[PDB]
Amino acid sequence: SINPWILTGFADAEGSFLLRIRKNNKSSVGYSTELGFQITLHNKDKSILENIQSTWGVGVIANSGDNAVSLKVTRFEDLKVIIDHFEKYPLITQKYADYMLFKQAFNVMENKEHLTIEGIKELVRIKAKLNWGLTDELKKAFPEIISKERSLINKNIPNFKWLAGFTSGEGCFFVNLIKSKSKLGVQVQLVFSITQHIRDKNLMNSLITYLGCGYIKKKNKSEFSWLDFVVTKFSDIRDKIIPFFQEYTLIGTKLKDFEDWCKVAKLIEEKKHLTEEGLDEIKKIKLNMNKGRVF
DNA sequence: GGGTTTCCACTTATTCAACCTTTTAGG
DNA sequence: CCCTAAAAGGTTGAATAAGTGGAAACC
Ligand SMILES: [Ca+2]
Ligand SMILES: [Ca+2]
Ligand SMILES: [Ca+2]
Numbered sequence: 001s002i003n004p005w006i007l008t009g010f011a012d013a014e015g016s017f018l019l020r021i022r023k024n025n026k027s028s029v030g031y032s033t034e035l036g037f038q039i040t041l042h043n044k045d046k047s048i049l050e051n052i053q054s055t056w057g058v059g060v061i062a063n064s065g066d067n068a069v070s071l072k073v074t075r076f077e078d079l080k081v082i083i084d085h086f087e088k089y090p091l092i093t094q095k096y097a098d099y100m101l102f103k104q105a106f107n108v109m110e111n112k113e114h115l116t117i118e119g120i121k122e123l124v125r126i127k128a129k130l131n132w133g134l135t136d137e138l139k140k141a142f143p144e145i146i147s148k149e150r151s152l153i154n155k156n157i158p159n160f161k162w163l164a165g166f167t168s169g170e171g172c173f174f175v176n177l178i179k180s181k182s183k184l185g186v187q188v189q190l191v192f193s194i195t196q197h198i199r200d201k202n203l204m205n206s207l208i209t210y211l212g213c214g215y216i217k218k219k220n221k222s223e224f225s226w227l228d229f230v231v232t233k234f235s236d237i238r239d240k241i242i243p244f245f246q247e248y249t250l251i252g253t254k255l256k257d258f259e260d261w262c263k264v265a266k267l268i269e270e271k272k273h274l275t276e277e278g279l280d281e282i283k284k285i286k287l288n289m290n291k292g293r294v295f
Numbered sequence: 296g297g298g299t300t301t302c303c304a305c306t307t308a309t310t311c312a313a314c315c316t317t318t319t320a321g322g
Numbered sequence: 323c324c325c326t327a328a329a330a331g332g333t334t335g336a337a338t339a340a341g342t343g344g345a346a347a348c349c
Contacts, residue, residue, distance in 0.1 A: 013311095016339050026298060034300080042337055062303055068337070075301060095339095115299085131340060132308090169338090172312050178327090179316075187326065195311050219332075226310065232328055254312095274326085290313060291336095 002051045005161035006168070006251060008089040010048070013169020015039045015095070017102040018074075019127050021120065021138060029117045035105050036074035037082050040064045044295065045252040048168075056081050079106055092155035092162070094199045100151070101130045121145075154202060157210055164248035170195050171254060173261035175286040188273040188282055190265060192241050194229040204229050213240050238265055253293065260289045 020034035039049060046061070049071035053059040058078040064070035073082055083103055091099055105126050113119030124142045128134050133148050157163055171194050178187040196204050198218075207229045208214050213236035217228040231237055242262055250258055264273075264282050272278030288294065 014338070016341090018341075020341080022342090024299090028298070032299065038340085040338060040340085044337090060302065063305090064338095065305065070303095072302085135341090170311070172314095174313065176315080180326095182326085187328095189328075193312075195313095197310065215329085217330080217332095221309095221333075224309070228312095230329085234327075 002048075002055050002251065003161050003165075004085060004089045005159040006165040007052060007055070008086065008091060009162040009165020009167075010169050010251070011037075011039070011086075011165075012091050012093040012095055012162075013166050014041060017095070017098045017130065019102065019105050019123065019130055021123055021127055023137065023141070027115075029115060029120050031120045033105075033109060033114045033120075033123060034074055035076065035102065035109060036072060036079060037102070038070060038072040040068055040070045041252075042067060043069050045069075045254075048252045051251075056085070058082070076106075076109060090155070090158075092153070092158065093196075093203065094150070094153050096153045096155070097151045098130055101126050157203075157206065160244075160248045163207075163210070164245060164250055167194060167245065168250045168252050168254055171250070172290075173254075173257045174290070175261070175264050175282065177283070177286070184274070184276065184279055186279065188264070188268055188279065189232060190234060190237050190261065190268065192231040192237060195226060196229075197226050201227060211240055211244065212236070234265075234268065238269060253295070256293065257289045260285045 015037065016039070017037050018035065022032050022034070023030060024032040039052070041048060046069040049059070049061050049069060052071060053061060058075070058081045059071050059073045061069065061071050073079060083106060086099055090096060105123055108114055108119055108123055108126070114123060121142070124134065124138055124145050125147070127138065128145050128148055129150055134142070134145065139145075172192070174191040174193065176189040176191050178189055179185060180187060194204070194207065204216055204227045208216070213233065214229050214231040217230050219226055219228060231241055242265060245258055249255065264285055267273055267278055267282055273282060286292075
């Protein structure tokens with residue numbers, strides 16, 4: 001079982017809303033629809049999608065390839081459980097707009113309007129603003145649907161447990177080894193990062209006030225660019241970040257990386273990172289965390 | 296048969312997470 | 323000058339997000 005604010009936070013990170021408008025000869029209006037919500041994680045974290053499936057009592061889980069597992073909810077009657085949860089515990093990222101389009105599509109299909117050509121047209125207008133918008137095929141079939149206008153989402157973090165769910169998705173507990181010509185040769189630096197597209201710059205900035213520490217780093221790769229909420233000062237990590245997530249527990253395999261992160265934190269707090277044996281212990285923990293974990 | 300929904304194997308594109316080094320701050 | 327800590331500054335690839343083909347299940 002999972003906490004409802006924890007789940008929305010995770011759904012802001014991972015999770016996605018789908019609207020399929022598929023050409024289908026056997027449909028009277030020539031199109032069939034499929035609506036729902038889905039999350040795709042590494043096989044690593046299939047436990048998360050089992051706890052969500054069990055808390056909602058809805059969703060089917062299936063492999064999304066060799067390295068990935070998927071939780072998909074499409075059965076139309078079952079999306080009421082999705083909508084009921086997100087109405088009481090709403091998303092706060094730009095995905096909240098994708099959710100509202102999804103809810104608008106729900107009302108279309110609930111009123112059986114998707115079986116009318118006009119209802120398909122409204123669904124194509126909803127799809128045009130949803131996620132990556134219209135397909136080439138749907139653009140060709142509907143050259144009049146042009147608005148890719150996205151509503152702007154701006155909400156505050158509604159709950160401590162929300163950030164714990166979001167950090168379970170976009171968080172990273174990293175142990176950096178700054179190599180130098182010193183006697184030890186390396187400086188151990190704990191880094192806590194939360195990554196997000198520049199779509200939610202104001203939400204990323206708000207973390208600095210919400211947690212009372214950190215700063216924002218802008219990264220880019222060719223046409224794409226994102227942000228990072230970064231904490232590198234150790235006193236903030238020891239007094240704020242670790243006590244925060246120790247009281248609002250994370251979920252998934254990323255939790256085990258946080259526990260090892262705290263193990264390194266106790267060692268540096270004791271100045272053991274200045275020694276040869278203490279620095280070797282930190283390296284053995286860093287090797288077994290994150291991409292080095294044995295499962 | 297004439298339609299509609301749901302499931303499941305699977306793909307694609309990118310936004311992530313995780314990993315690096317060099318430099319500056321601060322005592 | 324000495325010292326380590328914190329910040330600045332990237333790159334990378336895959337776990338994500340988002341979507342697709344096909345067809346069994348349904349009405
Ligand atoms: Ca995300
Ligand atoms: Ca994640
Ligand atoms: Ca993510």
